[PDB]
Design a protein around this nucleic acid. Sequence first.
RNA 1: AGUGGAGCCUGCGGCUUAAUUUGCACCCGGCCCGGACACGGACAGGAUUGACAGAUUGAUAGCUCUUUCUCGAUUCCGUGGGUGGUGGUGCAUGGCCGUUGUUGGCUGGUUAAUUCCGAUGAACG
Lengths: 121, 232, 59, 57
Amino acid sequence: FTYRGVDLDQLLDMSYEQLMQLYSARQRRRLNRGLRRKQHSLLKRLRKAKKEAPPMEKPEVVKTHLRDMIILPEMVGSMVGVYNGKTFNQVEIKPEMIGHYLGEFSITYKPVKHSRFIPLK
Amino acid sequence: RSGKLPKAFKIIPALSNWEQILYVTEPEAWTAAAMYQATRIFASNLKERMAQRFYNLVLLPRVRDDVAEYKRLNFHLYMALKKALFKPGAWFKGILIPLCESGTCTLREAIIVGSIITKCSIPVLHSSAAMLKIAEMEYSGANSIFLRLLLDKKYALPYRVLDALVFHFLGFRTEKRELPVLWHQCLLTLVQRYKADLATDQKEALLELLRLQPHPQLSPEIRRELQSAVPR
Amino acid sequence: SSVMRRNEQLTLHDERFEKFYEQYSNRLQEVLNDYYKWDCESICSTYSNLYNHPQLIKY
Amino acid sequence: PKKNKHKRKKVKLAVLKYYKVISRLRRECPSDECGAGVFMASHFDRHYCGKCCLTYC
RNA sequence: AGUGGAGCCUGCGGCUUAAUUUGCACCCGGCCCGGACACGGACAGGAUUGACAGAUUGAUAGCUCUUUCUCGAUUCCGUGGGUGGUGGUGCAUGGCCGUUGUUGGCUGGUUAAUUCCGAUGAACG
Ligand SMILES: [Zn+2]
């Protein structure tokens, strides 16, 4: 795997201020406006859930409503169940999921899935 | 609106200089849920006298101008005022009786806090003291609701209290003012509940009280309650 | 008070009214530190009416 | 989804745990408003005073 | 000149949907509180009030799930086809507005500025 020519290890080493130079324009604008208290809270929660995970299989489920959360490179490998309005959907955090919001991975609507008269006399 | 309250606000019961603390907190400017939580902590872990002072200073003007503005009572202030009724003596001496000698109490205020009286079983002794005190002071259109509902409490009435009540009604002997239907309702409730504790002289005294101040609708009920009463 | 009184019948209680009518820090520092398919009609289609017929007596 | 009201646990003989036979089986809170009978809740990691919110650990 | 043809957008129907509100109203989850009267139960052997900490929770919280500390009658459980009251609503009903002329009369900071905020009367028809 590589993202904009940059591998995951130095992505985790990559700083917050010039992480915006590989992200997109909406992405860069959002990171310039700064993450609020809920996003930092869920960052701490994900880091804690990754903390006491046993080192052989994936950590436990973290459930949230934060659909406007962006996937950051530190989240890669977390088990996040995001709300769609009715239920929670659990998703892997893959390395190539970096540029997309969390709310894209829990669709809030179901797809739409939708005898002639003949006279005898 | 909601959420956990800060721990710096739950220490005012343990803080001596509460007056400046509540003064710097802009006394005209809380909401109703803040009053609910504040009255909860000032009637739960607090003593009698400074809670009565809190009732005198803050709670009574708040409920008064709230019912003056919206002609009703908000949910949270109603819950706060009931949580003030959780401490009977402080709430009687800090809200009820100051509203009684306020003199400007309307029918809505009286009926709302009298319904609040009705929904809670108050102690008999201190309520009887309140009976005597509301009997001593003058009659307006608000304290009559309190008399009617507190006689509808149907407690064991002390006899000094009953002497004060009959002394008040003898005080209403020769007045020519048109008494309301609710006055006769109060008299009907008294002669319905405590007809057994009235001596014969009290019976006849209420009889000429009925004679001089009659009612085309409710006076025969008081007549038959007095005439079919079994004394002690 | 009044002038016409009980005169009879068992005064139980004594009416204590004198208290009513005549009535009218390291903790702070540490908490300061702590501060900071089927439905009901179509199902009738699967019912049969020809199995448990009683014996018919002819005339 | 109805929210049931909390019910206080009616414990049998709540008085009969702070004394022997003489002495105080539980601690006494050293504050000014609380003392001479205000016994001290001993939880498995801490102690609490139920009146003025004293906290020891 | 067009529209009706085509693409897109939008309005009524219809179809999907938890909701696709209706002639933020809608949906999915979490709080708060919800009579007295009568009768029968529990209740100082203690009714009941407040509470730290941890957790559940999308989140925290004595408003919940544990662990005992305190407050003590300030009580709380059940059944009624019995009323009902912080109810909504009409009528008679007492007070009170507006409705169908004439002549007089500076502690403070602030700005270009008698700048800004801040304290602060009379008669005649
Ligand atoms: Zn103590």
